Design a protein around this nucleic acid. Sequence first.
DNA 1: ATAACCTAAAATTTTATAGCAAAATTATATGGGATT
DNA 2: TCCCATATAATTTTGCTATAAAATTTTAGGTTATC
Lengths: 316, 316
Amino acid sequence: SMTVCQLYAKQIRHRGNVKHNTKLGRERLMRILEQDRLGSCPIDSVKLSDAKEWALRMKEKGLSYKTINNDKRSLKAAFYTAIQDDCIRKNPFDFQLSDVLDDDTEPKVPLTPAQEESFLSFIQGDKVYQKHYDAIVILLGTGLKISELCGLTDKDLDFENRVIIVSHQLLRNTGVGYYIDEPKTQSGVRKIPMNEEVYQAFQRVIKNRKGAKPFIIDGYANFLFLKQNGYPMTAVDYGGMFGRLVKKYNKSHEEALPKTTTPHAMRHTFCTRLANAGMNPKALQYIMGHSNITMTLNYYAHATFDSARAEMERLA
Amino acid sequence: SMTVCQLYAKQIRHRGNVKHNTKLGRERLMRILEQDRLGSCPIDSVKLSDAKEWALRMKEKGLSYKTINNDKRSLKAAFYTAIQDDCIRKNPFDFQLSDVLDDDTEPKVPLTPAQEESFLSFIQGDKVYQKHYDAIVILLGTGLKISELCGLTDKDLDFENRVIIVSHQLLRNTGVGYYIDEPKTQSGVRKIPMNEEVYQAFQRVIKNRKGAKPFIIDGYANFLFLKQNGYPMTAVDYGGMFGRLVKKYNKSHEEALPKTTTPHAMRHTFCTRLANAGMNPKALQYIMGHSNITMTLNYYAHATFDSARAEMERLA
DNA sequence: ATAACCTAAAATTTTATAGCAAAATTATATGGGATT
DNA sequence: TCCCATATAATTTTGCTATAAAATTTTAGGTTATC
């Protein structure tokens, strides 16, 4: 625990009950510390300027603002543990990154209703990506995360009541392969109603499903969305497909789609479209699956005096 | 700072830039420590068990649950600074008060629309409180805090646009007397529109204003709402008037008003009535002048799967 | 002749917060004054 | 008894920022299917 690499390594051991993607993210930061001059510095000599100069080298290395901010929080928790053990006194990472680096992050812009209909029309007619038409319709109409969509099976659907039961996700990583992840409490389980377009999409998925290879993981089988090899789709498989789909859309249309048109942009467009329509915020929170209500309110536009004037006159 | 009273006294001297009401509240807690055995104990001799026995003595003293929880927080921050500087390792106040004592908080039930009409009808038809009719109509139609209403002057009204510019408040305390409080940044300044009832209420206030004694403070003059002595109203003057008004109302009406029918209850009724009507939460946050949006979302009812399904089908 | 899929690897984004008191509002004891 | 004002006391309302996990997306290198 003397050096920063030894301090962060001891932090991983103290808090080890983590998921697989967390282990990959921690090792990513460990490789950063080992390749950086800060990794070999004794923790009792890391000053406030040393931590700020680390963020400068991270931005010069090429890392985005949110990455340096997330890695700083990981390092701040490590030094906070050393303060509890009286190894040091002050935390060198107790500063604002905005005072050292400028947040040059492109804001994620959702799809307008005009772009949303032009996008689905191109997908339905294209002979290469029409097989993904139903999934993108379901994503735009439910706000499901990409791994939640990949984890949907026949037992997760209630066609008698037109309700989607979101209770798990289907993840895949190098080495471990597929694995099912479920929330610890029932708060992570939510039910989403299906509209007419979403209902017709699920029926066309089941009626046109073929070539499914044997695949049972944690009692889950008969997945709805499969790859060309008969095995269920994953987040990486959808992300790569969206890259080729948007690039092909831009070549056939004069106005190009936003550069951030990813599977999560369907979730961002879903929450924004319902928020602009005046949906109940806590009801929209349940459909989205957010832990707190402040996270859902980020999708509501900033209110001014003129907007609140006509809004109060609307309910007078 | 070796004893609890000396530690909390050093905590007051550290963060001195406070308001007069804060100095009264800190003195109210200092008298609590001086009149309790846990005030003269050394900081290195107080464990977590001594904090639980102290909270039980405050509950036996008759203090409210929120009162003890707020005072236990001031003591928690007093020992938090002690751990950073003085010889201290563990904080004896790092515990949840709900485990020691129960919460006897009474729910603040808002006013139903039928009660408000009957409440405003009694005020108009009463020869003693009819002079306060226009003030209460404004509170229910704008949601102003009671000290934001007392600070309203002629220059704060824009009858050309029917806008209430809320930029300050008028407070009074024993010794200091009247004093104007202004926010630090422009975020604390809000603009509230006037409806037909609020507009006609402000017109009757100015047209019937008489007996205003000379009163200029921090450039503010010509206050709208005055006492019978010619000086502007305060929160205590409206609070005591409401207590006598509600008591007289319950003598003549069968369905008695809630025990918490206070000037703030008018603000609570204003916010809850707009949230139930489907108002934009960020537009409601601006009219209320809240810092964060979590407080505004508390007025929205908890959503279930049935309520969320109805909202999705309403916007499908 | 070019995408179109697949996967290990690398990068980025999404997700997630009470409470480490200030500072307001309201109730009460008290007394002089106006009503029933 | 009720109104009013006020010092005192009690109670309620209010305010700021994440002491990272765990997802999703992009990319380099390669093979395979369709323009």
